[PDB]
């Protein structure tokens, strides 16, 4: 603890950007801004509705902040899905993100989940009521198999949050707990399966590719975040339980051993990501290659992860990592750094109030 | 490999039985036969119903054989749940087992899964129709959290079977595939969460214990089966995709290296199983301790796994392992070896025909 392993999280970072073949960029600053606003505008209007405004107990500023964070992530990572697809996914991923804010015990609202579900009665928990109502707008872009994947992962995520409320990092010696919890709320199968709109792909035709992509992308996606993320949590305990911190508590190892473990899985998931899809269907490899780069581009740009600080304290160095850290860093900014004022407007609150 | 790793097998097996503290219990044969018949009787009557007889496309003999295999597993492992609970779980686990028999492509029957579900219209796929109809009888024995777990795992399992239809062992270099598939159809969270009936336990009170148990049991349960199963799935050219066989195809290692890998995870899951729950709530450790032993007892007794063959071949060897194994086996038999004629009757077909 204390004093960030500042270099390893640069080297590792470059190792990652190199492995994934951090080519240049996905869009052109204007294509991004174009999508950003399209997605944001549809979402903002959605969450601004009376019903949504009522059932979704969340602080306005938080909602605004979250919506904007999700839209960016989607628009920069699902680089090849229609504008509509970006938007709808953005609504769904905003719902999931906003659910992490609930402090309300699910228990009582989940006592009749299955009977209500099976009988088509509106769910008790208001979140389920909204998400299941909105789901068709997401699900329409996909085939039956990929849809099943989104449905499951979202269910898994609901359980994931329930567990998170107990702020439990696992019993010492419970090695299987950390990843069990990480998968539970990583939305991995939701992400990986949403990368294949039936309009651009055919599940039946690319079933083995898609299935393999879901399998592999799930871990790359969660671990790449856990890494980039380790910065805004190295100093924050208000987020006590985390894959790295749970490894420590569960596997009984040092924060460094834990952070080392993650770094090994991450670089490895990367190496294999490429080894498998490089020679596969071009369109497939392209969606994958783009999601990775976009995903990394987003982490480096969203103020959220405060990665700009790592920039500051590493702009004058002359290493073969401290430079490979900003050589890429900058690349991200030149195409992904965009002032919200250019796309995120008007504020959800304003639309809602109207 | 060419010949079975008998030596290696017998050892691993003992290390496993030792690690988990495999010892005789107070669950008497009379008690077993009593439960066996109770569960079987209720199930048989269930599957013998006209509707079940219609919608569940399965060969009678296979159904008979499966029902009997599932009842035994349940009754010998959920040693502390009510007779009714053993029965109901037996119906559910029989449904799941019988689904592996379908070659029918799920795709067309799953094109409207979510819309039908959300609207409360009977599912298109007949299996979902039956299982979701019968679900409340299982779910009544549990609290909301544990129920959510059963619901998810079962969904996961349905997808697991869909993937299995493609008889795909993973693309070479796709290390994440094997376990992805194994978890998908291991029903781990269904098993682990069904161990805590709300009549004997309180989710809210033992939440951390239960959650941890689900996380840990999932891997112990699937790997312990993959191991015991190894002897029968060795010379079965019919059995192509399996965790061990997929490790070979996916991780590009030898069948021995793969088998070796499994053996390490298995023994390890075991040690940690004990290290964690030994000092926890007595009732918890007891349900866990019993499930493991019962589960192992069942594998050694069910003719299915043809384990009696390794026994005979070794029963007259003055080896450290060999003899250590043979006694464990004998123990299992003396309490778990029971003639079907003592509990499984009349045959489902007969009841159905009536
Ligand atoms: C979008 C964020 C905050 C992080 C990326 C990591 N994923 C595992 C996310 C988990 C939570 C949601 C809502 C979506 C995907
Ligand atoms: C019960 C058999 C045949 C094998 C053990 C492997 N487990 C993963 C089972 C999968 C099928 C069910 C219903 C329960 C758990
Ligand atoms: Mg979060
Ligand atoms: Mg994180």
UniProtKB/Swiss-Prot annotation, chains A, B:
pH dependence (UniProt free text):
Optimum pH is 6.75-7.75.
Cofactor note (record): Some of the cofactor binding sites show unusual localization within the protein.
| Residues annotated as binding Mg(2+) 2 | 225, 229, 233
| Pathway annotation | Sesquiterpene biosynthesis; trichothecene biosynthesis
Query: Where does this protein hold Mg(2+) 1?
Result: 100, 164
Means of activity regulation? Benzyl triethylammonium cation (BTAC) acts as a competitive inhibitor of trichodiene synthase reaction in the presence of pyrophosphate (PPi).
Q: What, per the annotation, is the impact of changing residue 146 to F?
A: Leads to the loss of activity
Task: Give the reactions, separated by semicolons, that this protein catalyses.
Answer: (2E,6E)-farnesyl diphosphate = trichodiene + diphosphate
UniProt keyword Lyase, yes or no: yes
Any Pfam family the entry gives: TRI5
Q: What is the effect of changing residue 305 to F?
A: Does not cause large changes in the overall structure but increases the KM for farnesyl diphosphate by about 7-fold
Which principal EC class is assigned to this enzyme? lyase
**Residues involved in Mg(2+) 3 binding:** 239, 241
Please report what switches on or represses expression of this protein. Answer: Expression is positively regulated by the trichothecene cluster-specific transcription activator TRI10. Expression is induced between 18h and 21h growth on GYEP medium. The initial detection of trichothecenes occurs several hours after the initial detection of TRI5. The initiation of trichothecene biosynthesis occurs with a high concentration of glucose remaining in the culture medium.
Spans annotated as Aspartate-rich domain: 100-104
Annotated GO biological process: sesquiterpenoid biosynthetic process
Q: What is its EC number?
A: 4.2.3.6
Q: Cofactors per UniProt?
A: Mg(2+); Mn(2+)
Q: Say which family it is in.
A: Belongs to the trichodiene synthase family.
Other information: Trichothecenes are sesquiterpenoid toxins that act by inhibiting protein biosynthesis.
Quote the protein name from its UniProt record.
Answer: Trichodiene synthase
Q: Which organism is it from?
A: Fusarium sporotrichioides
């Amino acid at each position: 603890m204390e004093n960030f392993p500042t270099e390893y999280f640069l080297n590792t970072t470059v190792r990652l950007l190199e492995y994934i073949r951090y080519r240049d960029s996905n869009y052109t600053r204007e294509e991004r801004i174009e999508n950003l606003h399209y997605a944001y505008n549809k979402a903002a209007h959605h969450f601004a509705q009376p019903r949504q405004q009522q059932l979704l107990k969340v602080d306005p500023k938080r909602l605004q902040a979250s919506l904007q964070t999700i839209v960016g992530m989607v628009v920069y990572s699902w680089a090849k899905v229609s504008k509509e697809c970006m938007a709808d996914l953005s609504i769904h991923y905003t719902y999931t993100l906003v659910l992490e804010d609930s402090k309300d015990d699910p228990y009582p609202t989940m006592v009749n989940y299955f009977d209500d579900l099976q009988a088509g009665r509106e769910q008790a928990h208001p979140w389920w009521a909204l998400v299941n109502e909105h789901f068709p707008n997401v699900l329409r872009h996909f085939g039956p198999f990929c849809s099943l994947n989104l449905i499951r992962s979202t269910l898994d995520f609901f359980e994931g949050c329930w567990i998170e409320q107990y702020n439990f990092g696992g019993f010492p010696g419970s090695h299987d707990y950390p990843q069990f919890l990480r998968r539970m709320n990583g939305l991995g199968h939701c992400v990986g399966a949403s990368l294949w709109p039936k309009e651009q792909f055919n599940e039946r035709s690319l079933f083995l590719e898609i299935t393999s992509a879901i399998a592999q992308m799930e871990n790359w996606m969660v671990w790449v975040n856990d890494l980039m993320s380790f910065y805004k949590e190295f100093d924050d305990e208000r987020d006590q339980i985390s894959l790295v911190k749970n490894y420590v508590v569960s596997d009984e190892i040092s924060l460094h051993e834990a952070l080392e473990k993650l770094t090994q899985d991450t670089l490895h998931s990367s190496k294999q990501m490429v080894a498998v899809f490089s020679d596969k269907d071009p369109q497939v490899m392209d969606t994958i290659e783009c999601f990775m780069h976009g995903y990394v581009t987003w982490h480096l740009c969203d103020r959220r992860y405060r990665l700009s600080e790592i920039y500051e304290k590493v702009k004058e160095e002359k290493t073969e990592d401290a430079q490979k850290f900003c050589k890429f860093y900058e690349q991200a900014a030149n195409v992904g750094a965009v002032s919200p004022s250019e796309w995120a407007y008007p504020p959800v609150a304003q639309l809602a109030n109207v």
